[PDB]
Amino acid sequence: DRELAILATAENLLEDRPLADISVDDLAKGAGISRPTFYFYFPSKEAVLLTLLDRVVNQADMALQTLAENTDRENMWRTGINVFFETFGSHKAVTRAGQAARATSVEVAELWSTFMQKWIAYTAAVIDAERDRGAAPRTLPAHELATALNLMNERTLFASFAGEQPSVPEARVLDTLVHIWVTSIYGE
Amino acid sequence: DRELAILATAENLLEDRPLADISVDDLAKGAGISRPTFYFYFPSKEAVLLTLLDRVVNQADMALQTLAENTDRENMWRTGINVFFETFGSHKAVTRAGQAARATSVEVAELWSTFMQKWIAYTAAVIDAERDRGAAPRTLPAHELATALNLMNERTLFASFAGEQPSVPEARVLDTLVHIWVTSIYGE
Ligand SMILES: N#CCC(=O)N1CCC(c2nc(-c3cccs3)no2)CC1
Ligand SMILES: N#CCC(=O)N1CCC(c2nc(-c3cccs3)no2)CC1
């Protein structure tokens, strides 16, 4: 509860500054607590980002699970990719911080890797279902095609939300990715 | 010349250790020079990685220029993506280091961004040429389609070469990307 306040403070601060320019004293102060009381909840600011990413990742995973318990094929994929556009799009600071943190934090890398393996495995299953039903041609190995498409979405989403040059404009991202997914899944 | 030796030492060391676990004393020693003589050539180890990435990036850019001064459409794109698979594939350590460095080094980010804008702009031009000749349908904005495909290759190449979980196996990468590029460029 003082915990949530640390979390909300970190999320707020990461909007304007990297994690490197946020001190533990910054988190404690925004949360209305002392520095030692902070250390009772988190051993470090990295530990804060980790929890924030865990929440975001689980939120996208739960929304995708919701979707999976149920339009034409283009709209089907668009709704799925939209889960990630919206969830990560709603937590750009955290998303952006956690991506950069993969390169330093072994635990951030593991968290991200676990969830990506999951989303890939789900994409691959649907793609195999589409093949099984005769909707999609048996072209590339489904799991490798799934891997490349999910890596694309990851990089494209995060570049767009960060305003990186180069990037697809946020308002064009969803159409761009959907076109690529549908053509590479259903085409030959 | 003592310069090249620093560069070759860094490249060698980065094979087994991140840049964080390589000290300036490590670079000087492998190069057969003292620590102050090192500082004459580079103000920092980051400056070393920057130069190494510059070389790799320019090498892929020059190979792509070579290719551009000249098979069917699938083989055309496969040869282009192969330029990057092979060039980055031949410098995995540096490539891997420089990707992680984008997140900390403003200059590494600028170098990478400049070259990506260039490769995107070239992909977009060829795609527009393909449309102009009636080989490819006018679907998405060429420059946005180009952006997404090049971001995919970047992320997929680097994940594969790093042995990340998840990744496409290095021996399947080229086929995977080619399939995606050709279907999304020529399909509807
Ligand atoms: N980043 C990231 C992951 C991502 O963009 N996706 C795109 C959507 C993929 C996906 N949708 C589905 C759907 C099933 C039914 C409706 S939709 N099954 O898999 C999950 C990963
Ligand atoms: N990473 C990264 C960049 C990359 O993979 N590509 C793929 C190849 C793209 C490309 N090939 C061509 C070709 C023209 C003629 C033969 S081929 N024009 O553009 C450049 C960027």
UniProtKB/Swiss-Prot annotation, chains A, B:
Q: What InterPro entries would the database entry show?
A: EthR_C, Homeodomain-like_sf, HTH-type_TetR-like_transc_reg, HTH_TetR, Tet_transcr_reg_TetR-rel_C_sf
Which keywords accompany this UniProt record? DNA-binding, Repressor, Transcription, Transcription regulation
Q: Which parts of this chain does the entry mark as a DNA-binding region?
A: 23-42
Instruction: State the superkingdom.
Output: Bacteria
Q: Which GO terms describe its molecular function?
A: DNA-binding transcription factor activity; transcription cis-regulatory region binding
Where do the HTH tetR-type domain residues begin and end? 1-60
Keyword Mitochondrion listed:
no
Q: What does this protein do?
A: Involved in the repression of the monooxygenase EthA which is responsible of the formation of the active metabolite of ethionamide (ETH).
**Record note on quaternary structure:** Homodimer.
Protein name as it appears in the record: HTH-type transcriptional regulator EthR
| Organism whose genome encodes this protein | Mycobacterium tuberculosis (strain CDC 1551 / Oshkosh)
Q: Which gene is annotated as encoding this protein in its UniProt record? A: ethR
